[PDB]
């Protein structure tokens, strides 16, 4: 005799059903928003005829069984594992299952793979009919029960709630099977006190949340201070079930729908230059059919100090028409959906998690995709031999110094913007011609997409 309490419920996630260990099974920590179960359909038949004293009666029948449903919320806890000194999160199996359908591999470049600097999940390599196959084990007080096989359908992150950051998971399953015996020792598989102590200080606070937004076509950067917002990853999981009538049925397979990295924002109305007014006015006035926006919502902010932060990046995301609200202080709402470049490319967006994030690391993740790889921050041009002047029919193959020296993209493109006095090629051997009595401006663009410029005007004249 005993009553099961919710306060003593522990949820374990495993990628296998037997031969459990610490690398295939892992415990995660949930919040009060925990739900599970499995509802059933029922067909009902009845008769109807015009005779007196009719046959009033019915007989219910069970016909099938809907897919199980579960949902829970967990805090975002980017920390470092003393075993490998690589940044991980307690709920990384869930991220891998939501991101890719291949086997789990933390050292790769697809799915949910971690680096020595950050643990980042890539939504590329998700084109599969079913995602990673997890079995959710639920411990409540003493009785053991589990869901046979789950595929995560949604993940919600909300910044409007004032508490620390949370992720809201929601999925489905084949059948909720109660268990009669303990599958594995709870303590050996579950997280220890050491990991709890190491992650107790890596919470991410929503009080400090910034956003980077920029239109690619017009090349305008905006300073929007967020007052709320959210972004939700949805796999649109639809289940399949035979509908035979003689026997109760069980769903057999699941088909993925359409990847949807939909999100939304809201902020106050600030008349300052490049504020929310600029974005509102531009979006409404231009009235383009489709936009190409580069949004970046950064939980935990970016500081020079090494502090934890969670990052969402949505390249070329579509932004809908902003809708103005009306309350005590005027505020606008912008809703965006991260469309991909190609329907099959799968570069809709990527996330980043780390405990030692810095402004430079965050910037090079935004413009490079990874925290470890560097990115160019400034660029200046230098002529061959440091000559700032040129004459007609002269060769000056200038060079460029890159900053910082550890950037991965050490090569750029050569372009001419203002003035017609000389021509250059990709190699860089600039040449001029005759009848040139004017100066020209040479410009360069980084091939990594950072957007750093090196400017110089050479006074090309008729010569001596």
């Amino acid at each position: 005799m005993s009553l099961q309490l919710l306060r003593n419920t522990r949820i374990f996630v495993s990628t296998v059903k037997t031969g459990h260990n610490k690398t295939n099974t892992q415990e995660i920590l949930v919040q009060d928003d925990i739900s599970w179960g499995q509802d059933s359909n029922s067909t009902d038949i009845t008769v109807n005829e015009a005779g007196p004293r009719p046959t009033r009666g019915s007989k219910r029948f069970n016909d099938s069984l809907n897919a199980a449903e579960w949902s829970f919320s967990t805090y975002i806890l980017p920390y470092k594992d003393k075993n490998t000194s690589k940044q991980i999160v307690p709920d990384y199996m869930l991220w891998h299952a939501l991101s890719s359908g291949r086997a789990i591999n933390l050292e790769g470049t697809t799915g949910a793979h971690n680096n020595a600097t950050n643990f980042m999940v890539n939504f590329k390599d998700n084109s599969y009919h079913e995602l990673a196959m997890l079995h959710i084990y639920i411990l409540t007080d003493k009785t053991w029960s589990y869901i046979d096989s789950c595929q995560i359908n949604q993940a919600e992150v909300n910044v409007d709630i004032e508490d620390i950051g949370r992720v809201t998971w929601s999925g489905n399953g084949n059948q909720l099977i109660p268990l009669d015996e303990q599958p594995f020792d709870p303590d050996q598989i579950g997280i220890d006190d050491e990991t709890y102590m190491t992650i107790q200080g890596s919470y991410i606070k929503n009080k400090l949340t910034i956003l980077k937004i920029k239109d690619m076509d017009t090349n305008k950067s905006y300073d929007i201070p967020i007052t709320g917002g959210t972004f939700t990853i949805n796999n649109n999981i639809t289940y399949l079930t035979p509908n035979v009538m003689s026997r109760v049925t069980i769903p057999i397979g699941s088909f993925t729908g359409a990847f949807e990295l939909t999100g939304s924002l809201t902020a106050y109305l600030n008349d300052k230059s490049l504020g929310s007014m600029e974005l509102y006015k531009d979006l409404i006035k231009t009235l383009k059919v489709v936009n190409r926006f580069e949004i970046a919502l950064v939980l935990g902010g970016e500081y020079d100090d090494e502090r934890p932060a969670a990052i969402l990046v949505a390249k070329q995301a579509h932004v809908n028409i902003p809708t103005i609200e009306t309350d005590d202080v005027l505020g606008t709402s912008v809703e965006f959906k991260a469309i991909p470049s190609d329907l099959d490319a799968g570069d809709e967006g990527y996330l980043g998690f780390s405990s030692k994030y810095t402004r430079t690391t965050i910037n090079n993740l935004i413009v490079n995709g990874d925290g470890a790889t560097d990115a160019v921050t400034a660029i200046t041009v230098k002529s061959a031999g440091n000559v700032t002047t040129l004459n007609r029919s002269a060769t000056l193959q200038m060079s460029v110094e890159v900053t910082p020296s550890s950037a991965r993209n050490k090569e750029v493109t050569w372009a001419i913007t203002a003035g017609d006095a000389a021509t250059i090629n990709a190699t860089g051997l600039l040449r001029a011609d005759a009848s040139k009595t004017g100066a020209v401006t040479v410009e360069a663009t980084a091939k990594d997409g950072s957007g750093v410029k090196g400017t110089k005007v050479i006074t090309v004249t008729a010569g001596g």
Partner: protein
């Protein structure tokens, strides 16, 4: 970055600047700059009419992007003598203070910085939530309370 005393000084300075003889049509009386947020004993009050600015509790709430909403409460007291009719004079002072608070632009207060970087900043909200006066005091002496709860967003 609270600037509560800065807000009180801006209140005092605005009250001293306005409600003077420069605009005798929009205001009733002249204080001759007899304004100071520093309180004094009632028996020590030198001449009337006199206005004192009290600073009370100061709450606040946070916002996702480093923004901060900070509500500052500024009880205001006016003391004046029954030279002609005490009820009418306090009436005039209260009406003038309400006009000063409501009309014009928002508050202008100067925020100082450790490295001598003083720059002006302005608040947003200015609401007189309630006004009450106390009776039963000494017959010549009077008192009225005007409750302004200035709502300001501190820099950064």
């Amino acid at each position: 970055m609270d600037h509560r005393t800065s807000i009180a000084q801006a209140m005092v300075d605005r009250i001293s600047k306005q409600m003077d003889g420069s605009q005798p049509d929009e205001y009733f009386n002249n204080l001759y700059g007899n304004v100071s947020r520093q309180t004094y004993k009632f028996e020590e009050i030198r001449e009337f009419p006199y206005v004192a600015v009290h600073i009370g509790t100061e709450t606040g709430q946070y916002l996702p992007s480093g923004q901060q909403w900070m509500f500052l409460e500024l009880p205001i007291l006016v003391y004046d003598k029954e030279k002609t009719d005490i009820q009418e004079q306090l009436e005039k002072l209260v009406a003038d203070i309400k006009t000063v608070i409501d009309t014009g632009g928002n508050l202008e207060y100067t925020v100082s910085k450790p490295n001598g970087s003083t720059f002006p900043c302005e608040a947003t909200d200015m609401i007189i939530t309630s006004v009450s006066t106390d009776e039963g005091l000494l017959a010549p002496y009077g008192l009225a309370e005007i409750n302004v709860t200035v709502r300001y967003q501190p820099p950064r």
